[PDB]
């Protein structure tokens, strides 16, 4: 009976944040194809 003394949802499996987004003029994590001049 003590198994039901305390289930809204669950904790998130993964999280995404702003610092995970890349930035940089030279950083190749932002370069897919060259932008025309």
């Amino acid at each position: 009976s003590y198994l039901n003394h305390g289930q809204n949802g669950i904790p998130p499996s993964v999280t995404w944040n702003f610092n995970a987004m890349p930035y940089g003029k030279e950083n190749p994590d932002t370069k897919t194809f060259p932008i025309p001049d």
Binding site: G24, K25, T30, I35
Partner: protein, 110 residues
């Protein structure tokens, strides 16, 4: 150049409010053409005094560069009093809006 003290005194009288009422009374029966002609005549009288008296008279500030130095000094005073003040204000404005040097930032990279 000459009569800088008189010019300072003129500015003082102009800022004095009582002189505002005096000028309001003097402007009774007066035209914009007359006012403009009077101001232009005053300026011409100053410059003509200079042109005439520089031929034979020397002021206390006479120097091997003549009135060029007095004119440069007038310009430098104007600069430091007005333009550098405006620069200070603009600097504080830019530093509050974008950060120091924000007006010289490079465009956002693409």
């Amino acid at each position: 150049g000459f009569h800088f003290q008189q010019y300072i005194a003129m500015a003082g009288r102009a800022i004095n409010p009582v002189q505002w009422t005096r000028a309001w009374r003097r402007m009774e029966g007066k035209s914009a053409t007359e006012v403009y002609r009077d101001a232009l005549a005053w300026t011409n009288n100053q410059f003509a005094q200079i042109s005439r008296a520089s031929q034979y008279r020397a002021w206390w500030w006479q120097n091997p560069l003549g009135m060029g130095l007095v004119l440069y000094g007038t310009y430098k005073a104007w600069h430091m009093i007005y333009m550098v003040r405006k620069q200070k204000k603009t600097a504080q404005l830019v530093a509050a809006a974008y950060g120091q040097g924000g007006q010289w930032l490079n465009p956002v990279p693409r």
